[PDB]
């Protein structure tokens with residue numbers, strides 16, 4: 001919960017949606033809730049229209065699996081790295097902005113929602129193709145956030161250690 005209008009960081013230049021699909025593991029995020037997933041992964045599959053189906057899955061402490069299915073749609077025709085995502089019929093879409101990705105190793109995703117023009121809440125996820133990233137990559141991605149006035153101090157490391165080999 002923050003003062004002012006939503007930050008509007010630059011997004012990934014020359015973004016190629018065709019190289020984005022497949023499985024991404026969650027490495028770090030701004031937590032959305034104080035409750036509980038590990039081994040967090042999302043599978044993206046690119047459709048005919050440029051819509052992207054998203055299947056998010058996580059393991060809970062008791063070893064059960066929680067899943068949610070959603071769809072990402074480009075918000076506009078100018079900037080292919082600015083999408084919006086919807087997971088439930090009853091939930092308005094949320095921005096899904098790809099700030100940086102090399103398609104083969106990492107992606108930084110940002111989302112911000114206003115609470116009037118005077119306040120906002122924002123979120124960010126560092127994703128990877130593998131279950132871990134070099135500390136210097138994580139640092140470089142957090143620097144993007146910081147340099148755009150997005151706070152990284154509340155970010156948590158997702159447990160990719162107590163997890164199956166997939």
Ligand SMILES: CC(=O)[C@H]1CC[C@H]2[C@@H]3CCC4=CC(=O)CC[C@]4(C)[C@H]3CC[C@]12C
Pocket residue numbers: 024025026032040041042054056068085087094109125127
């Ligand atoms: C792991 C991953 O790719 C991240 C990037 C965008 C993330 C989603 C963005 C929307 C979202 C917000 C919530 O309120 C619950 C979790 C979810 C449903 C997120 C789950 C993890 C996702 C899918």
